UniProtKB/Swiss-Prot annotation, chain B:
Organism of this sequence: Venezuelan equine encephalitis virus (strain TC-83)
Localization of this protein: Virion membrane; Host cell membrane
Source lineage: Viruses, Riboviria, Orthornavirae, Kitrinoviricota, Alsuviricetes
Role played: Plays a role in viral attachment to target host cell, by binding to the cell receptor LDLRAD3. Synthesized as a p62 precursor which is processed by furin at the cell membrane just before virion budding, giving rise to E2-E1 heterodimer. The p62-E1 heterodimer is stable, whereas E2-E1 is unstable and dissociate at low pH. p62 is processed at the last step, presumably to avoid E1 fusion activation before its final export to cell surface.
Subunit structure: Interacts with spike glycoprotein E1. Processing of the precursor of protein E3/E2 into E2 and E3 results in a heterodimer of the spike glycoproteins E2 and E1. Spike at virion surface are constituted of a trimer of E2-E1 heterodimers. Interacts with 6K protein. Interacts with host LDLRAD3 (via domain LDL-receptor class A 1); this interaction mediates viral entry to the host cell. 2 adjacent E2-E1 heterodimers in the trimeric spike interact with host LDLRAD3.
Residues of the full protein shown: 335 to 546 of 1254
Domain of life assignment: Viruses
Modified how: Palmitoylated via thioester bonds. These palmitoylations may induce disruption of the C-terminus transmembrane. This would result in the reorientation of E2 C-terminus from lumenal to cytoplasmic side.
Site (Interaction with host receptor LDLRAD3): Y44, V93, V153, A155, H156
Name the UniProt record assigns to this protein: Spike glycoprotein E2
Glycosylation sites: N212
Membrane topology (UniProt): Single-pass type I membrane protein
Swiss-Prot record, chains H, J:
Tissues and organs where the protein is expressed, per its UniProt entry: Expressed at high levels in brain, lung, skeletal muscle, and pancreas. Expressed at moderate levels in heart, placenta, and kidney but not detected in the liver.
Compartments reported by the entry: Cell membrane
Function: May influence APP processing, resulting in a decrease in sAPP-alpha production and increased amyloidogenic P3 peptide production. May regulate ITCH and NEDD4 E3 ligase activity and degradation.
Quaternary structure note: Interacts with APP precursor C-terminus. Interacts directly with ITCH; this interaction promotes ITCH auto-ubiquitination leading to its degradation. Interacts directly with NEDD4; this interaction promotes NEDD4 auto-ubiquitination. Interacts directly with NEDD4L. (Microbial infection) Interacts (via domain LDL-receptor class A 1) with Venezuelan equine encephalitis virus/VEEV spike proteins E1 and E2.
Recorded consequence of changing G7D: Loss of infection by Venezuelan equine encephalitis virus
Positions of region ((Microbial infection) Interaction with Venezuelan equine encephalitis virus/VEEV spike proteins E1 and E2): 4-31
Disulfide bonds: C3-C16, C11-C29, C23-C38
Organism expressing this protein natively: Homo sapiens (Human)
Protein name, entry field: Low-density lipoprotein receptor class A domain-containing protein 3
Part of the full-length chain shown: 27 to 64 of 345
Length: 50, 212, 49, 53, 49, 50, 49, 38, 106, 38
């Protein structure tokens, strides 16, 4: 059963929802994001010092 | 030193296993073929058999021999008595432990066979053996000459690279030739220097680990 | 089986998206009214009831 | 006689449709027919991986 | 039966994803072996394509 | 380094106490618990010979 | 790939259970009513079970 | 028990041999099951 | 199955050789269609082999230095059972009914 | 020099024999190079 939703990009806060199939019992879905990284593609050119 | 590389297979023994297509019917065979891997190019397969190669019946090194099991008793022949074929005859290169390196043409089965004084042993398994050419001119026997290309063949020497197969304790093999009938009781004669165990349900539940 | 003041539960099968039928029970007719919903499977492995 | 046994087909369901992913080891007949007055049968020899809708 | 039925994250990852449609069968009467049926290798079929 | 196991004795894996021509099944019992070991090859190659 | 197989665990007139090793694509079915064989005759001595 | 192929004799170990190999003076079964009651 | 005089003998071939009937053991006789075959048993004029498919059949034995052979152009064919067309019979699978030559000489 | 095959030993005459035939106790190269320095 294809179910699409949307979650805000904010850590710590639990995000709750359910899935209502039209003649069955509602299925609850919970997603709590903990740590959301962002890792760029990093390319060393040179180092320097004294 | 090659004995430091053969030292692993001193720890092990050959065994008998099930071959569904023997010399007459479906037997228990000394030369059961566990696998055939043929992923190199110019005709080189790699059998994993139930026998062992390069070792004599005690555990030392001999050059071109096959060490198989025969109802418990571990026997040997030279390697040039063993032949195999797929559709044409193959050509054995060498062996090391449970494995063998042949030079086989393409076909749809492997039949290893050897011959004793009168008993002919065989094992056929329906495993496809495939032949892979290099490049963009499809041959079936590699040519006399041309140019050279980067291929991948199975190596001709045993050498410790990062790929392992897994050993285990053997189970108990029931052997009939031990139990015999006396006048009124059941006589069990375990082999010399070797324990056994007998389980019966002639009276009640029974278990006894007898030693010689 | 009927008790004195209990409630009897039956199972039925339908094709109706708004089924409504008179249920005869041994003398009398009671009206059963509801709204059915599509099932979850497309292809099943038993014929139609 | 012992006969071989082909791999399990991978059946995907749709509205009034059945898809079949078929990976055979050796060539294998797929024989289909409808359970109606017109069966419309299909006797096919599949030797390669093939999808049949 | 297709590319990537075996998925190891690196070459020596010691954690592989296998979806090969492996099914166990019942052994023959009077024989000690493990029979099985599975879809053939998809890396070989990808090399064939 | 890496210490193999035969008992509660963390011995160096390249220094076996025994050999295979001495004990029939104690080298085997040493290779029992030492399967999950990054020095299994060192242990075996040092542990067969004298 | 390479389908790894385990050696068959036979209990003579008893019953067995499934112990998962969590290996990749691992199947573990248990078959009753067996009469297995070695090269040295029959293995168990019962007819069923 | 019974061999799958019709014209065969079954040894003690389950190996099926031809029926003309039973009681022939030559051992074919492990532990001579074709050489017991001839 | 007969000896060189007329009585029973286990696994032997009996053949006429310019008048004088001779015999050899049956493990000395080889035959092949395309691959080598496997003799099961013999009884009188008939033999039960196990051959793969091929477009001829060749039987040959060898004397001390004289080799004898016969090749005839008869199609030897292989027949699977059921709806999977194997070329060599498998190691396992579902049991199915078939129709094979009986091993015994009944 | 070097053999094309991954694991072969090259004789004096250039014939490549496998690696486990070097110092094994049998003559394989013409004039036994494999059996010289063991
Ligand atoms: Ca006999
Ligand atoms: Ca040499």
């Amino acid at each position: 059963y294809e179910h699409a939703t949307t979650m805000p990009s904010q850590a710590g806060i639990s995000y709750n929802t359910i899935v209502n199939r039209a003649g069955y019992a509602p299925l609850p879905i919970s997603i709590t994001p903990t740590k959301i990284k962002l890792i760029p593609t990093v390319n060393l050119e040179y180092v320097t010092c004294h | 030193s090659t004995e430091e590389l053969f030292n692993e297979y001193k720890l092990t023994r050959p065994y008998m296993a099930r071959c569904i297509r023997c010399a007459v019917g479906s037997c228990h065979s000394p030369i059961a073929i566990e696998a055939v891997k043929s992923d190199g190019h110019d005709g080189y397969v790699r059998l994993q058999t139930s026998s062992q190669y390069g070792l004599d019946s005690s555990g030392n090194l001999k050059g071109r021999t096959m060490r198989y099991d025969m109802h418990g008793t571990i026997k040997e022949i030279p390697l040039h008595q063993v032949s195999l074929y797929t559709s044409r005859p193959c050509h054995i290169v060498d062996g090391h432990g449970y494995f063998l390196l042949a030079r086989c043409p393409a076909g749809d089965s492997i039949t290893m066979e050897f011959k004793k004084d009168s008993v002919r042993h065989s094992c056929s398994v329906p495993y496809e053996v495939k032949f892979n050419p290099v490049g963009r001119e499809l041959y079936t026997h590699p040519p006399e000459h041309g140019v050279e290309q980067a291929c991948q063949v199975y190596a001709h020497d045993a050498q410790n690279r990062g790929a392992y197969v897994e050993m285990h304790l053997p189970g108990s093999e029931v052997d009939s030739s031990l139990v015999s009938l006396s006048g009124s009781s059941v006589t069990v004669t375990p082999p010399d220097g070797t324990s056994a165990l007998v389980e019966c349900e002639c009276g009640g539940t029974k278990i006894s680990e007898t030693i010689n | 089986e009927l008790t004195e003041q209990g409630s009897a539960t039956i199972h039925f099968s339908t094709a109706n998206i708004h089924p409504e039928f008179r249920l005869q029970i041994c003398t009398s007719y009671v009206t059963c009214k509801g709204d059915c919903h599509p099932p979850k499977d497309h292809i099943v492995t038993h014929p139609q009831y | 006689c012992t006969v071989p046994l082909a791999p399990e087909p991978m059946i995907t369901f749709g509205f009034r449709s059945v898809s079949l992913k078929l990976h055979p080891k050796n060539p294998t007949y797929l024989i289909t027919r409808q359970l109606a007055d017109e069966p419309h049968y299909t006797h096919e020899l599949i030797s390669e991986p093939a999808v049949r809708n | 039966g297709a590319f990537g039925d075996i998925q190891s994250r690196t070459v020596s990852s010691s954690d592989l994803y296998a979806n090969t449609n492996l099914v166990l069968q019942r052994p023959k009467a009077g024989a000690i072996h493990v029979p099985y049926t599975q879809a053939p290798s998809g890396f070989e079929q990808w090399k064939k394509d | 380094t890496t210490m193999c196991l035969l008992a509660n004795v963390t011995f160096p894996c390249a220094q076996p106490p025994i050999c295979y021509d001495r004990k029939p099944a104690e080298t085997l019992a040493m290779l029992s618990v030492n399967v999950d070991n990054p020095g299994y090859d060192e242990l075996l190659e040092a542990a067969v010979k004298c | 790939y390479k389908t790894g197989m385990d050696s068959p665990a036979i209990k003579c007139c008893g019953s067995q259970e499934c112990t998962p090793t969590y290996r990749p694509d691992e199947q573990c079915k248990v078959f009753t009513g067996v009469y297995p064989f070695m090269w040295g005759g029959a293995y168990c001595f019962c007819d069923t079970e | 028990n019974e061999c799958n192929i019709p014209g065969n004799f079954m040894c003690s170990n389950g190996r099926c041999i031809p029926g003309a190999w039973q009681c022939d003076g030559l051992p074919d079964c492990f532990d001579k099951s074709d050489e017991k009651e001839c």
